[PDB]
Ligand binder design. Sequence first.
Ligand code: FQ8
Ligand code: FQ8
Ligand code: FQ8
Ligand code: CL
Ligand code: CL
Ligand code: CL
Ligand code: CL
Ligand code: CL
Ligand code: MG
Lengths: 314, 315, 318
Amino acid sequence: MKKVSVIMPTFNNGEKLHRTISSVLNQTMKSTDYELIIIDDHSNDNGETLNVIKKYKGLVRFKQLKKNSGNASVPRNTGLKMSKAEYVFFLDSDDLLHERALEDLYNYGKENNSDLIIGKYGVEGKGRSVPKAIFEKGNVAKADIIDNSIFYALSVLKMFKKSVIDKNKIKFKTFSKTAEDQLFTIEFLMNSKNYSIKTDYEYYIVVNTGNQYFATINEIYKAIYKSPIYKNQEKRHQLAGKYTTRLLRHGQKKNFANSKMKYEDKIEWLNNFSKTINKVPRDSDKYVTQIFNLKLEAIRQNDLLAVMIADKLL
Amino acid sequence: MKKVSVIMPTFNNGEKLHRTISSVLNQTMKSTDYELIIIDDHSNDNGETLNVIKKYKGLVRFKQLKKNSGNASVPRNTGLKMSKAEYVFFLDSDDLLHERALEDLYNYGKENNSDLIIGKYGVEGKGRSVPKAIFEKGNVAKADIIDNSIFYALSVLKMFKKSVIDKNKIKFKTFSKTAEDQLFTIEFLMNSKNYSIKTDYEYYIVVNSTGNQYFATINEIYKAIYKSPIYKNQEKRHQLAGKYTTRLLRHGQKKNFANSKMKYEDKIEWLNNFSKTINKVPRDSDKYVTQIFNLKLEAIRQNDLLAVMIADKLL
Amino acid sequence: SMKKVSVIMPTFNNGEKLHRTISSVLNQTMKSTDYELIIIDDHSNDNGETLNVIKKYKGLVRFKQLKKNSGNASVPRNTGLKMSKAEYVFFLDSDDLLHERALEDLYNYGKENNSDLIIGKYGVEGKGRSVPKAIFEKGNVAKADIIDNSIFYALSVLKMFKKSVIDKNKIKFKTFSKTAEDQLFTIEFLMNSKNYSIKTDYEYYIVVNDFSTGNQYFATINEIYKAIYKSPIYKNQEKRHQLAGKYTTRLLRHGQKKNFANSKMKYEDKIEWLNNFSKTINKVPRDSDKYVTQIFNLKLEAIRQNDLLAVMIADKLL
Ligand SMILES: O=P(O)(O)OC[C@H](O)[C@H](O)[C@H](O)COP(=O)(O)OC[C@H](O)[C@H](O)[C@H](O)COP(=O)(O)OC[C@@H](O)[C@@H](O)[C@@H](O)CO
Ligand SMILES: O=P(O)(O)OC[C@H](O)[C@H](O)[C@H](O)COP(=O)(O)OC[C@H](O)[C@H](O)[C@H](O)COP(=O)(O)OC[C@@H](O)[C@@H](O)[C@@H](O)CO
Ligand SMILES: O=P(O)(O)OC[C@H](O)[C@H](O)[C@H](O)COP(=O)(O)OC[C@H](O)[C@H](O)[C@H](O)COP(=O)(O)OC[C@@H](O)[C@@H](O)[C@@H](O)CO
Ligand SMILES: [Cl-]
Ligand SMILES: [Cl-]
Ligand SMILES: [Cl-]
Ligand SMILES: [Cl-]
Ligand SMILES: [Cl-]
Ligand SMILES: [Mg+2]
């Protein structure tokens, strides 16, 4: 049984993929203790991506999907089915691992009986930013969702204990193109106890209508409110309130109301947002950061003018 | 007939009550020209309050209520029934009178044929604050409600002409725990003409819910304005109502409820009561409300919580 | 012997001060035989004071007396149009003044540039109604554009209009409302012609200041939007949206009672006013909204939603 399976979807990455694969093969961890599973989502770049992968024949596991799924969920699920390791680590095909990432994260996890180990993120170039607050207290052996800002770091670019995934049948969902990674991490967090944060290095380097989206958000709230770990109803309210805050600070199209979106699309978007939030108990609202009090109430009331106004006052 | 009856409810005041009673008994006014009427609202502090009062036996009038009413209204009404003086003065059992208060206020009242005399308030310690603007123009023999800020000084800690109370059957009401003193003063103001303000000293020293009952009291305030036999002109009534609305928005109970930590359902119920009350007040009064409150007032009339929240964010 | 210009001037109870206006028209650099002043009195009742002034210029002006006071400039202006057989007309308000070079300079610039419309720079005397400025900030413009030369911000009829455009398209002043009928006339003209000129060498026209449910007003505004959306000149639908959006902006910047929402207007009148405003705007395609200046995004949406509180709030944030 391998210590770690690194699971990496590819699609039309081309020659730049060398740098990523190289970062995985050059680890302090013993090469025989881990594997890189590459799942190509039917690249169509005149064989450029496949030619890169072929250069590492014998050194990686590889599966080619027959059709392009359009999303990371299907290839990630494929990778999960192929892994029989102790832990999995998801890697995006443009990113880099620090040479000490697998060894340091695995060892910290084993030492602390961790279900989840989160290594400090670094970033290369302007673009998507990375979580920071989660790493500001140094190494944490037994982290807390609220106190260690975990709902602000919900990517799957982390080390997950495979048995938790298997026992709870946690799969990436394919309903929406967005936030399915958050749902996966939330489902995992709500079904496990032991989370660890490791900050010695930048272990992982990120390299730079709403029907479906809000169905995914709805699943996030459902996962919190059915958690067998966080069973206490007031605790669930606190967690839900924190997710609401994160959604208002960082969600997709957070500033839609005053945007150039067509009126009819704003109405439909807000309608989906409103329906989703109105399934979340009002008891969670007091745990939302209070600068958002008006915006949250405007969304509950499904009132576009009031959302527009709330955004002008923020 | 005494010049003044000082009416003072007590409840579990204990030893500190000495200081208050002493301030009343030590006045420049001739001791035989006034009386202190103490009405105990059934203190239950192991006889501590009653023992203080007993030390002034023979020197004060005293009545013990058999049950604790829970507010000042019942003991104040008891005091009114007991007084046959020319003027009454209500005193809270923690407060102090300046030594010249009864004489100076009475004399100013008699000289100006005053129905109401208001002496300058001082305050000791943080807590409930006192009116200031009413006293910034010095002594005023014939004050005006609007120009002399009287709707911002509606406590009953004042000297009231007893005949006005008797003829108009003005009693403290007991519906709510709050604002019943405002209602009394408003009823008095709306049934009298002559008000005086005296500022030579700090004559009186203040020493530091669904809304169903509170808004019923507020409703009575507006009714008193609109049935005033003194202020009979309808436009004048609108002006007075508008001024009360302003005071309510500046100083009312839970004025900032909309963005508070109150539960949503309680905000809705509170605003519902507020809205019902305000919507019995003619819209003709709205133009006499200080105009920074125009949006907040309209939001309340529309019973629209989001709009009230927004109005408060812009104030 | 078709005249170059007919100046059309309604009068009502102007009295002795009318001398100054009439004199400004008779003292032009243009040859006196090349133009005419048509005076239409809207039944003055000032003990013959206005008529006595006009009588002093008998034989130098054309004159028509209306039997009843219409109450607005539309009827007398229409009377003037029927009487004119000139190449161009120029509307003049009875309190205002023409610069001595106005008819000659504007006509010549128009003839040189085949202009349907010539706009001379406005000056103003005394505090009161203001005059457009941005339209004149680029100097002389031979072939102006409605959007780039701010023409929707200068919609008075105090301008030189080619008469054939008025005749062919049967453009008449409407009498439904007491307000904005001049805007509608200018808009109808603009939407049925191509060539506009701006002349700024002098203050050619001097505005002299002397010291409502909305049912009719918004019906007039409705006609403005209809004229834009049926323009045979601006036929492209996206261009129509752009023009409509610009008019909406002008309406929100300068319209009648623009700040009604937070005013001391009675509540029921605010509601009725907003109701008329809302009904009118909701006949204008939402595709025009992106061409409205975006500080007005909330106010415009509040009006579309017929929501008084939201209009009040929008005005507090502007
Ligand atoms: O109001 P509170 O007290 O609750 O917190 C306010 C603080 O300011 C708080 O510390 C900040 O919200 C946290 O800022 P940060 O610098 O730690 O992190 C910012 C964001 O979390 C970060 O930039 C990303 O937006 C987080 O993305 P992920 O959690 O990795 O989401 C998964 C990702 O694959 C994707 O689903 C989304 O990123 C798509 O936008
Ligand atoms: O020109 P406007 O009217 O738009 O502006 C008003 C001015 O700014 C005015 O000067 C202030 O509103 C008032 O100035 P102030 O500092 O002299 O007065 C402050 C308050 O009136 C005062 O702190 C309290 O409101 C006193 O309340 P009272 O009317 O004396 O009695 C109420 C009390 O007995 C009780 O009923 C309530 O406190 C319990 O709900
Ligand atoms: O369009 P944007 O958002 O990029 O910016 C607009 C500018 O900020 C500005 O508004 C423009 O340059 C125009 O400003 P202005 O100073 O040149 O002119 C202001 C107004 O156009 C003018 O003061 C009048 O309000 C316009 O009236 P008119 O169109 O000449 O005729 C209307 C009048 O005859 C009548 O219909 C009613 O106004 C009488 O009640
Ligand atoms: Cl999101
Ligand atoms: Cl109050
Ligand atoms: Cl002459
Ligand atoms: Cl244009
Ligand atoms: Cl207008
Ligand atoms: Mg609203």
